[PDB]
Amino acid sequence: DLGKKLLEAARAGQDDEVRILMANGADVNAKDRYGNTPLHLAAYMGHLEIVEVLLKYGADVNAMDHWGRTPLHLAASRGHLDIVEVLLKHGADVNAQDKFGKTAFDISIDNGNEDLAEILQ
Amino acid sequence: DLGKKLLEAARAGQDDEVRILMANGADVNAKDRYGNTPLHLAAYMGHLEIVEVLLKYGADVNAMDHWGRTPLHLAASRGHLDIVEVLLKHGADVNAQDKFGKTAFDISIDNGNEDLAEILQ
Amino acid sequence: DLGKKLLEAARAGQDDEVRILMANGADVNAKDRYGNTPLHLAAYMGHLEIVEVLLKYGADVNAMDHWGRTPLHLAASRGHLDIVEVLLKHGADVNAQDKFGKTAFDISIDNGNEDLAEILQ
Amino acid sequence: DLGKKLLEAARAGQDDEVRILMANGADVNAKDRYGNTPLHLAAYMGHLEIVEVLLKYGADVNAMDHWGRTPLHLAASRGHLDIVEVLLKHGADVNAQDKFGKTAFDISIDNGNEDLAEILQK
Amino acid sequence: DLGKKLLEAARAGQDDEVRILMANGADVNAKDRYGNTPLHLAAYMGHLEIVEVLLKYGADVNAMDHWGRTPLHLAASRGHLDIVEVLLKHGADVNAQDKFGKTAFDISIDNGNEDLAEILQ
Amino acid sequence: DLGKKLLEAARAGQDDEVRILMANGADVNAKDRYGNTPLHLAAYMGHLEIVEVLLKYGADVNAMDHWGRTPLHLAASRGHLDIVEVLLKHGADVNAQDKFGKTAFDISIDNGNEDLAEILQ
Amino acid sequence: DLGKKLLEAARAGQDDEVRILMANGADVNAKDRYGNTPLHLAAYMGHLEIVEVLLKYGADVNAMDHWGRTPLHLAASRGHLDIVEVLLKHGADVNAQDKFGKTAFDISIDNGNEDLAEILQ
Amino acid sequence: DLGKKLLEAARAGQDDEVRILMANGADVNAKDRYGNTPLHLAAYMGHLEIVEVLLKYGADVNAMDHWGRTPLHLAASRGHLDIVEVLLKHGADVNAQDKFGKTAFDISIDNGNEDLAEILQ
C-alpha cells in the first residue's frame, strides 16, 4: 500500500518519493507493526526535509509508538537537534512520558546531550 | 481546576501560587495523566520549599506514579539530596520498589549520585 | 539555571561570581554533560579559593565524573599540590579508583609528578 | 509478622534475630510485597553469613521476585562476588532470565564486573 | 526429548552432538521456557558453526524470545560480529524492535559497540 | 558510493577528487566503520585545503568518531596547529571530552605541544 | 568487617593485624568495592612479607579486580620485582590479559622496568 | 584439542610442532580466551617463520582479538618490523582501528617506533 511505501520512503530518506506519495494521497499517519508513523521514522533517522513535508501534510506531531514514544522522544534519542526544534515549534508535548516513564529531557540527560537538554529545558 | 494549577505551579517552582492554591482548597494529592502528584513534580524539579509546604498540607510522601515511582525515586533520579533528606524525614519508604524493581538507591547508583547512595544506605 | 552559571564560574576562576551564585541558591553539586561538578572544574583549573569555598558550602569531595574521576584525580592530573592537600584535608579518598582502575597516585606517576606522588603516598 | 521480622533481619544482617525467628516457626521462604525472600535481601545487602545460614535453613536458592530475579541476579547486580560463589555452590541457575531477559552474567557485563563475569561463565 | 537436548548442545557449543540430534529429527525451532530457540543460544554464546548448521537445517533466523528479541538482537548484545554477518546474510530483520522498542542497532549503541552499530547502518 | 570515495580522497589528500565529489553530491558527513568523517581524516592527516572545502560544504566541526573524538582532538593528536585554528574559529567544542575523558588540551599536554596547549588554553 | 579490616591491613602492611584477622575467620580472598583482594593490595603496595603470608593462607594468586587485573599486573605496574617472582613461583598466569588487553609484561615495558620484563621473559 | 596446542606452539616459537599440528588438521584461526589466533601470538612473540607458515595455511591476516587488535597491531606494539612487512604483503588492514581507536601507526608513534611508523605511512 502507499502507507507501507511512505514509511519505507521516510525511513530511507527518499525525499522525492515521500513528496510523490503524499501528493498521491498516502495516509500521513500510517503505522507500521510497532506503531511508528512516517514522522517517527524520519525523526529517528534524522531526515529533516521529510519531517517538514510530513508536518505540512497534517502529521500528528504527538503520535505514539507501541512504547508511548513520540517523534520528539525518537529524535532526542538520536541527537537530532534541528528536528527536535521543528517538532517543538509545531506543538510537541515536551512533558510526554513514555511507557518507561521517561521524557525527551530524561533521554537527553541519559545521552549527555547538553544542547538538547537546554532546548527541552 | 486548582489541581491542574497546583501541579503546574509545583513543576514551575511558583512557591507563592502553590500557597495560594492550597489556601483556596487545591488537592495536595492531585494527579496528572501519568499519576504525578505536586510532590512528584516538585521533587523532580528540585523545588525544596514547595516539597516542605506540600508535605505540611498533607502530601502523600509515598504516592506512586504509573511506573510505581514515589517522589524519593524521582528526587534521587535528578540528584536532589536536600529533597531526599526532607522526604526521608517525612516517612519516605526507602525500600519501595518501582514497576521495574528499582529502589531510590538503585536509581541513584544508576545515575552517578553516589553521595545520595550513602545517605540512602 | 544557576547550576550552569556555577559550573562556568568555577571553570573560569570567577571567585566573586561563585559566591553570588551560591548566595542565590545555586546547586553546589550541579553536573555538566560529563558529570563534572564545580569542584571538579575548579580542581582541574587550579582555582584554590573556589575549591575551599565550594567545600565550605557542601561540595562532595569524592563526586565522580563519567570516567569515575573525583576532583583529587583531576587535581593530580594537572599537578596542583595545593588543591590536592585541601581535598585530602576535606575527606578525599586517596584510594578511589576510576573506570580505568587508576588512583590519583597512578595518575601522578603517569604524568611524571614525582613530588605529588611522594605526597599522595 | 515472623516472616516480616525475618525479612527485616535478613536485610539488616541480624544473625541473632534470624536464629530466634527460625526457632519460633518463621518461614525461611517468607515473601514481602515484591516477592523478595530473606535470601534475596541478604544477597542484595551483602550479608554473606546470613546467606549461608538461610541456605542451611532451606532457603530456595532460585526463588524469584516480581521481576523474575533470583538472589544470584541481586548479588551480581550489587557486585557481591563471595555471595555469588556461595549461591552457585548451592545450585543457583546461571541461565535463569528475569522479566527483562537478563541473566546474572548480563548484569555483570552491564556494570563492568569483570571478576564476577569470569565466575559466571566458568 | 530431542528438543531440550538440542537447546543444551547448542548452548554448550557441542557441534557434533547438534548434528546427531538433527539427524535424529530434533526440532531446529525447539524453544526453552524463555522462547529461546537453538539459534538464539548459539548466537548469544558465540558458536558460529552451530549457527551455520542450524540455519542449514532450516532454523528461523527471525525467531523471537519472550521479549521479542531475535538471534541478531542477542548476537548484537554480545558483540559477535561474525554471527551478525551470517544472520544478516540469511535474512535477519535489522529493523525488528523487541518488547522494549529496541533494534539490534539500539542494543549495539547501548552496549557501546558502535562498530557493529555502523554495520547495522 | 560517493561517500566512501570522499573519505578515501580526504584521507589521501586528493584535493581535486574531494572538490569533484562534493559538487557531485557527496555527503560531507559520510561515516566510515569507525565513525570517521572526511573532516576527521583530513584533520588527522594535515590536509588543510580539504578541511576548508569540507567546512564550506557544511562539515559538522563537532562530529564524533566511535571514541567521542572530534576533528579538533585528531588535529591536536597529530599537532596540526593551522587546522586547529580553522576548526576553533568555525565553532569547535574546545572542552569536548572523548570516551577517555580527554580534551584536545589534555592530548596537547600529553604529546607535549606547548604551542597547541597555549592556543587551546 | 573482618574482610574490610584484612584488606586495610594488607594495604598498610600490618602483619599482626593479618594474623589475628585470619585467626578470627577472615576470608583471605575478601574483596573491596573494586574487586581487589588482600593479595592485590599487598602486591600493589609493595609489602613482600604480606604477599608471602597471604599466599600461605590460600590467597587466589590469579584473583581479578574489576578491570581483569591480577596481583601480577599490579606488582608489575608498581615495579615490585621481588613480589613478581613470588607470584610467579606460586602459579601466577603470565599470559593473563586485563580489560585493556594488557599482560604484566606489557605494563613492565610501558614503564621501562627493564629488569622485570626479563623476569617475565 | 589441536587448537589449544597450536596456540601454545605458536607462542612458544616451536616451528616444527606448528608444522606437525597444521599437518594434523589444526584450525589455523583457533582462538584463545582473549580472541588471540596463532598468528596474533606469533606476531606478538616475534616468530617470523611461524607467521609465514600460518599464512601459508590460510591464517586470517586481519583477525581481531577481544580489543579489535590485528596481528599487525601486536607486531607494531612489539617493534617486529619483519613480521609487519610480511603481514602488509599478505593484505593487513593498515587503517584498522582497535577498540581504543588506535591504528598500528598510532601504536608505533605511541611506542616511539618511527621506522615502523614511516613504513605504515
Instruction: For residue G15, give Cα distances in angstroms to D12, G37, G99.
Output: 32, 16, 32
Quote the domain boundaries for residue A68.
Answer: 2-120
Count the alpha carbons within 13 Å of F105 in the hemisphere toward its beta carbon.
14
Using a CB–CB cut-off of 8 Å, the residues of E that contact D are 11, 34, 65-67, 69, 77, 100, 111
Q: Are E108 and E114 in contact (CB under 8 A)?
A: yes
What is the rounded CA–CA span in Å between residue A65 and residue A33?
A: 9
Q: Mind spelling out the 3-state secondary structure of chain H?
A: CHHHHHHHHHHHCCHHHHHHHHHCCCCCCCCCCCCCCHHHHHHHHCCHHHHHHHHHCCCCCCCCCCCCCCHHHHHHHCCCHHHHHHHHHCCCCCCCCCCCCCCHHHHHHHHCCHHHHHHHC
- Residue B119 CB partners (closer than 8 Å, separation 6+): B81, B84, B85, B88
Concatenating the DSSP letter of every residue in G75-115 gives HHHTT-HHHHHHHHHTT--TT---TTS--HHHHHHHTT-HH
CB atoms within 10 A of CB F16: 8
Angle at CA G63, nearest 5°, toward G61 and G64? 140
- Residue D91 CB partners (closer than 8 Å, separation 6+): D61, D62
Using a CB–CB cut-off of 8 Å, the residues of E that contact F are 114-115, 118-119
- Residue G99 CB partners (closer than 8 Å, separation 6+): C101, D112, D114, G67, G68, G69
Concatenating the DSSP letter of every residue in A26-53 gives --TT---TTS--HHHHHHHHT-HHHHHH
What is the rounded CA–CA span in Å between residue F48 and residue F80?
A: 9
Reading phi first (left if > 0) and then psi (alpha if -120 to 50, else beta), residue G115 is in: alpha
Instruction: For residue G96, give Cα distances in angstroms to A120, G61, G69, G99, G105.
Output: 47, 12, 8, 10, 10
- The three cell numbers of residue H118 are 614511516
Q: Using N-to-C axis directions, what is the helix angle for H15-23 and H2-12, rounded to 10°?
A: 160
Q: Mind spelling out the 3-state secondary structure of B11-74?
A: HHCCHHHHHHHHHCCCCCCCCCCCCCCHHHHHHHHCCHHHHHHHHHCCCCCCCCCCCCCCHHHH
Q: Using CA coordinates, name the residue in chain C closest to G65.
A: C101
Q: What three-state secondary structure class fits B121?
A: coil
Count of structural domains, chain H: 1
CB contact under 8 A, E67 and D101: yes
Measuring CA to CA, which residue among C91, C86, C116, C89 is closest to residue C104? Answer: C116
What is the rounded CA–CA span in Å between residue H77 and residue H89?
A: 18
- The three cell numbers of residue G41 are 593490595
Q: CATH code at C28?
A: 1.25.40.20
What is the rounded CA–CA span in Å between residue H77 and residue H56?
A: 24
Concatenating the DSSP letter of every residue in chain A gives -HHHHHHHHHHHT-HHHHHHHHHTT--TT---TTS--HHHHHHHHT-HHHHHHHHHTT--TT---TTS--HHHHHHHTT-HHHHHHHHHTT--TT---TTS--HHHHHHHHT-HHHHHHH-
Residues in chain G: 121
- The three cell numbers of residue D92 are 543457583
Instruction: For residue H93, give Cα distances in angstroms to H62, H90, H104.
Output: 6, 10, 9
Residues in chain E: 121
- Chain C residues within 8 A of G65 when measuring between CB atoms: 101
Let me know if G118 is exposed, middle or buried by CB neighbors in 10 A (0-12, 13-18, 19+): exposed
What is the rounded CA–CA span in Å between residue B3 and residue A119?
A: 27
What is the rounded CA–CA span in Å between residue E18 and residue G39?
A: 43
Q: Using CA coordinates, name the residue in chain A closest to C35.
A: A112
What is the rounded CA–CA span in Å between residue H96 and residue B22?
A: 65
Measuring CA to CA, which residue among F80, F76, F79, F78 is closest to residue F52? Answer: F80
**Interface test mutation site (partner E, options F1, F7, F32, F33, max chain E beta carbons within 10 A):** F33
* F19 sits in which H/E element: helix F15-23
**Grid-cell match 502507499, residue found:** A2
CB contact under 8 A, G66 and D118: no
What is the rounded CA–CA span in Å between residue F116 and residue C80?
A: 21
Measuring CA to CA, which residue among D69, A8, H36, C16 is closest to residue B100? Answer: D69
- The b/e string for A86-99 (b: 16+ C-beta within 10 A; e otherwise) is bbbeeebbbebbbe
Q: Using N-to-C axis directions, what is the helix angle for C2-12 and C15-23, rounded to 10°?
A: 160
What is the rounded CA–CA span in Å between residue G8 and residue G18?
A: 9
- The three cell numbers of residue A65 are 509508538
CB atoms within 10 A of CB G97: 22
Measuring CA to CA, which residue among D55, D62, D67 is closest to residue D95? Answer: D62
Can chain G be said to touch chain A, i.e. do they have 3 or more Cβ pairs within 8 angstroms?
A: no
- Chain E residues within 8 A of F35 when measuring between CB atoms: 114, 118
- The b/e string for F57-76 (b: 16+ C-beta within 10 A; e otherwise) is bebebbbbbbbbbbbbbbbb
What is the rounded CA–CA span in Å between residue E121 and residue E38?
A: 27
The one-letter amino acid at D96: A
What is the rounded CA–CA span in Å between residue E102 and residue E64?
A: 13
What is the rounded CA–CA span in Å between residue A88 and residue A120?
A: 8
Measuring CA to CA, which residue among C60, C112, C120 is closest to residue C94? Answer: C120
For chain D, the residues before each gap (C–N > 2.5 Å) are none
Q: Are C46 and C83 in contact (CB under 8 A)?
A: yes
Q: Are C26 and C50 in contact (CB under 8 A)?
A: no
Q: DSSP strand E in chain C: where?
A: none
* E77 sits in which H/E element: helix E71-77
**Interface test mutation site (partner E, options F1, F34, F65, F66, max chain E beta carbons within 10 A):** F66
CB contact under 8 A, D97 and E11: no
The one-letter amino acid at C40: H
Q: Using CA coordinates, name the residue in chain H closest to G97.
A: H34
- Chain G residues within 8 A of H77 when measuring between CB atoms: 106
How distant is the alpha carbon of residue A78 from its chain centre? 11
Angle at CA B57, nearest 5°, toward B53 and B62? 90
Using a CB–CB cut-off of 8 Å, the residues of A that contact C are 112-114, 117, 121
What is the rounded CA–CA span in Å between residue A81 and residue A51?
A: 13
> What is the resolution of the experimental data for this entry, in Å?
2.0
Q: Are D3 and D28 in contact (CB under 8 A)?
A: no
Instruction: For residue B91, give Cα distances in angstroms to A82, B55, B57, B60, B101.
Output: 44, 10, 15, 9, 20
- The three cell numbers of residue C55 are 567545600
CB contact under 8 A, C66 and F100: no
**Grid-cell match 585554528, residue found:** F85
- The three cell numbers of residue G101 are 588487553
Q: What three-state secondary structure class fits E53?
A: helix
| C81 phi, psi to nearest 5 deg | -55, -45
Q: Mind spelling out the 3-state secondary structure of D53-109?
A: HHHHCCCCCCCCCCCCCCHHHHHHHCCCHHHHHHHHHCCCCCCCCCCCCCCHHHHHH
